[PDB]
Symmetry: D2
Subunit: 198 residues, 4 copies
C-alpha cells in the first residue's frame, strides 16, 4: 500500500523562492490525493487482473498513469528541493553537465526552455540516458513520469503545473523557473546521477 | 488580425463566484497572450505556406492549435458568463437538456464530471452534434478547441485550467464547478443553440 | 491465462469478400501474437503490482493496451463476420439504426466514413452508449479497444489496419469496406445490441 | 505546388529485398495521394488563413500533418534506398555511428528495434540532433514527420506501415527489416549527415 512521504523540511523552508502556502497545498492536498487514488486504482487493477478482465484493465490505465505518475514525480521533486539547496553542482555531475550541454548556464537555459515550453500541464526533466550513457533533457505531459514513459532516469524535475507557482508568480512561469534554481538540492541530484554510473 | 475582445462586464461582475483578480488575470494576461501568439503564428504560417515549407508548417501546428484554440475558447467563455445569469435556462434549450440528459440536474452532474475529470489542463463542454441533431458533452485537453478538433458546436464551456480557479478555490476544483453555475449566461447558450437549428 | 479463440468457420468461408489468405494470417499470426504478448504482459504486470513498482506498471501500459486491445477487438471481429452474414438487420436493431442514423443506408455511409477516415491503423465501430441509451459510431486508433477507451459497448467493428485488406484490395480501403457488408453477422450484432437493452 | 518525385531507379531496382509490386504501389498510389491531398489542403489552408478562420485552420491540421508528413517521409525514403547500396557506410558517418551507438551492428539493432516496435503504423528514424551535435534514433507515428514534430534532422528512415512490406513479407516485419539493410543508400545518408555539420 503506497503512502505519502513526509517532506525533508518545513513548508516554509523554501521561502522566499517557493512560499509556504504552495508547499502545503502541493504536498498535503495534491500529492496526498495522488497516493489515495493510486492505492484505489491498484486495488481495482488487481481485481481486474485476477479476473483477466482486460477491458477493465485498460479502463484503469489513465488513473494509474496520472496518480501513479503524480506519486513518482512529486516524491522525486521534494528530494530535489532543499533549504540547503541552490548554487551549482560540483564534481562529476558538473563535469557531465559541461560535457553534455557545454556548461552549467547552457544547461539551465535548456531545462528552463523545456519547462517553459510545456503547453498545458507537465514537467521538465534532467534525466540520465542509460543506453547512450549521457544526460538528456525531456519534457513530460500532465503527470506522465519520466522513467515509465521515456526510459530515462530522473535526476532533476521542474513541476510546471500551474499549482506549482500560481499563488506566488501567477501567470509568469519564467519568474518561477528563475527562482527555483535557488532551492535545487544538487546533493540529491548528484546522488541520483552517481547511482546511474553504477 | 485577431483582437482581444472586451469582457461584456467588469472584472468584478461575477463576484463572489469568480473573483475579480482571476477575471483580470485571465483576460488581461492569459487571453491577451493567446491573441498575440495567434497573430504571430498566423503570419509565420503564411510565410511557410508561400514557400511550400511543409516542415515549417507542421512545426507551427502546436502553437496555432494552442494559441488559436485559447483565443476561441476564452472568447466563448466570457460570453457564457453573466452577473445576471445562473439558475436554469428557459425555453427550448431546457427541453433539449431534458431530452438528451434526462433533466437539468442530471446534465449539470454530467458536465461537472466531465470537467472535474480532466487529468491535466483542459475544458469541459456542452456541445451540439449537428449530424445527430442533439446535445453532446465532451472534454478537450489543453486549449484544443471543441469545434475544430471534434466537430461539435460549442454551447457552454467550463475552463478547468488551474488558472481559472486557483487563486480563489485553491486545489478544490469541485468548489469552483459548484460556484460557476451561478453565473452561466443562458441567453448566450440559447443563442448558440438556436444557431445550430440546422 | 488468455487464449486464441477458434473461428466460427473455415478460413475460406468469407470468399470472395475476404479471401482465405487474409483470414489465415489475420487469425493465426496477428491475433495469436496479441494473445501471447497479452499473457506475458499481464504476468509481468502482476509482478510489478505485487511489488508496488509503479514505474514498471506504467512502462507496461502500451503493451497491455495494444495486445489486450488486439485480443478484445479481433475476438469481437470474428463473431461479427459469418459466411451466413450480409444483408440487413431486422427487428429492434434495425429500428434503432433507423432512429439514430435515419436509415440503414445512412448508417452504412456513416460507419464507412468513420472507418475510411482513420489516418493510420485502427478500427471503426458501431457501439451502444449506455448513459444516452442510443447507438453511436466511433473510431479507435491502433488496437485501442472501444469499451476500454470510450465506455461504449461494441456491437460491430470494422478493422482498418492494412493487414485486414491489403493482400486483396491493396491501397483501396473503400473497396474493402464495400465488400465487408456482405459478410456482416447481423445475428451477432443483434445479440450484442439486445444484451444492452438489459 | 508540390510534385511527386520520380524514383531514382526503376520499380524493380531493389529486388529481391523490396519487390517491384510494392515499389510501384508505394510510389504510384500511396505517395501520389499524399501529394495531391497536401496540395489541396494547402490551398484550403490559405483560404482559412485569409479569412482568419481559426476553427477551419485547426480542423485542417490532421490532413496537413498526415499528407504533408507523408510527402516528406516518402520523398526521403526513396533517396535512402539504392540498387547499389547495402553494407556499411564509409567515412565520417560510420565513425559517428560508432561514437553514438558503439558500432554499426549495435546501431542496426537499435534502429531495427525502434522500427519493429511501432505499435501501429509509423516510421523508424536515424536522425541528427543539431543541439547536441550527435545522432539520435526516434520513432514517429503514422506520417508525423521527424523534423517537424521532433526537431531532429532525418538521415535514414524505415517505413513500417504494413503497406511497405505486406505483399512480400506478410506479417513478418523483422524479415522486412533484415532485408532493407541490403539496399540502404549510404551515399545519400552521408549527404544528409554532412549537411548537419553545423
Ligand atoms: Mn505538482
Ligand atoms: Mn483559461
Ligand atoms: Mn486486425
Ligand atoms: Mn509508406
Amino acid at each position: 500500500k503506497h503512502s505519502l512521504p513526509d517532506l525533508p523540511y518545513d513548508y516554509g523552508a523554501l521561502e522566499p523562492h517557493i512560499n509556504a502556502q504552495i508547499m502545503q497545498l502541493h504536498h498535503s492536498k495534491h500529492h496526498a490525493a495522488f497516493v489515495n487514488n493510486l492505492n484505489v486504482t491498484e486495488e481495482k487493477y488487481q481485481e481486474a487482473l485476477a479476473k483477466g478482465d482486460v477491458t477493465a484493465q485498460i479502463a484503469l490505465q489513465p488513473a494509474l498513469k496520472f496518480n501513479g505518475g503524480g506519486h513518482i514525480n512529486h516524491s522525486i521533486f521534494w528530494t530535489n528541493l532543499s533549504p540547503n539547496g541552490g548554487g551549482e553542482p560540483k564534481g562529476e555531475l558538473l563535469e557531465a553537465i559541461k560535457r553534455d550541454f557545454g556548461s552549467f548556464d547552457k544547461f539551465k537555459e535548456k531545462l528552463t526552455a523545456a519547462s517553459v515550453g510545456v503547453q498545458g500541464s507537465g514537467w521538465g526533466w534532467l534525466g540520465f540516458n542509460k543506453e547512450r550513457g549521457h544526460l538528456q533533457i525531456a519534457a513530460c505531459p500532465n503527470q506522465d513520469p519520466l522513467q515509465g514513459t521515456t526510459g530515462l532516469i530522473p535526476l532533476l524535475g521542474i513541476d510546471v503545473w500551474e499549482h506549482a507557482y500560481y499563488l506566488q508568480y501567477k501567470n509568469v512561469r519564467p519568474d518561477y523557473l528563475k527562482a527555483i534554481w535557488n532551492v535545487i538540492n544538487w546533493e540529491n541530484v548528484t546522488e541520483r546521477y552517481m547511482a546511474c554510473k553504477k
